[PDB]
Design a protein around this ligand. Structure first.
Ligand SMILES: CCOP(=O)(COc1ccc(C[C@H](NC(=O)O[C@H]2CO[C@H]3OCC[C@H]32)[C@H](O)CN(C[C@@H](C)CC)S(=O)(=O)c2ccc3ncsc3c2)cc1)OCC
Lengths: 99, 99
């Protein structure tokens, strides 16, 4: 679909079999979700944002459905203010910016 | 144009008579620019992201040109690591997300 930007580009995602809301974020290299339980092995990682760095759990090759489009990739879990879908998964669902 | 997301969506902007590179960021409500001494009145503000908050100066009715398309609105100036074009200006150039 075509998504305009008058409101936050919030969409419903499915991950670990649960539904959640997340922001499509072209300024984010990586996908970061609020704390949640996810199956699988993970490793500690650090990521930086506008205000400094946070510690996250890095889960590799996770299935996530974004408005019904499937992606399989890296998902970071940690104390983000909002669930964000970054470019690593936006590229998999075929997202572009147009103006 | 159409901008794919394999790489960071960096574009040239013109603001206060100067050229800069800036990230087109659908996850950013507002526009945040690197330290720059703009003329006119401003108001202090705090904006938050991953890692916490930063102190910025809020300027109103600032003209920015983004790949030849003009936009006018609020611009926040402070110690951001990157120039960020947010939805307040992206809407004005008709920018949409398409997958
Ligand atoms: C030189 C580089 O230094 P650096 O690496 C960080 O650089 C950076 C690169 C890009 C961005 C843009 C930010 N992306 C992000 O956090 O992405 C992370 C996840 O993926 C990784 O890739 C990029 C970073 C990692 C989002 O797109 C927009 N954000 C809001 C978002 C959290 C929704 C609430 S916002 O900027 O917080 C913001 C902007 C305007 C605004 N108006 C009112 S609120 C408000 C808040 C910030 C910093 O670390 C040094 C400590």
């Amino acid at each position: 679909p075509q998504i305009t930007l008058w409101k936050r580009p919030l969409v419903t995602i499915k991950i670990g079999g649960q539904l959640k809301e997340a922001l499509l974020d072209t300024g984010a290299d990586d996908t970061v979700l609020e704390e949640m339980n996810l199956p699988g092995r993970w490793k500690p990682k650090m990521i930086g944002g506008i205000g400094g760095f946070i510690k996250v759990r890095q889960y590799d090759q996770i299935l996530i459905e974004i408005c019904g489009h499937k992606a399989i990739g890296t998902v970071l879990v940690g104390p983000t203010p909002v669930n964000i879908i970054g470019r690593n998964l936006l590229t998999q669902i075929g997202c572009t910016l147009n103006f």
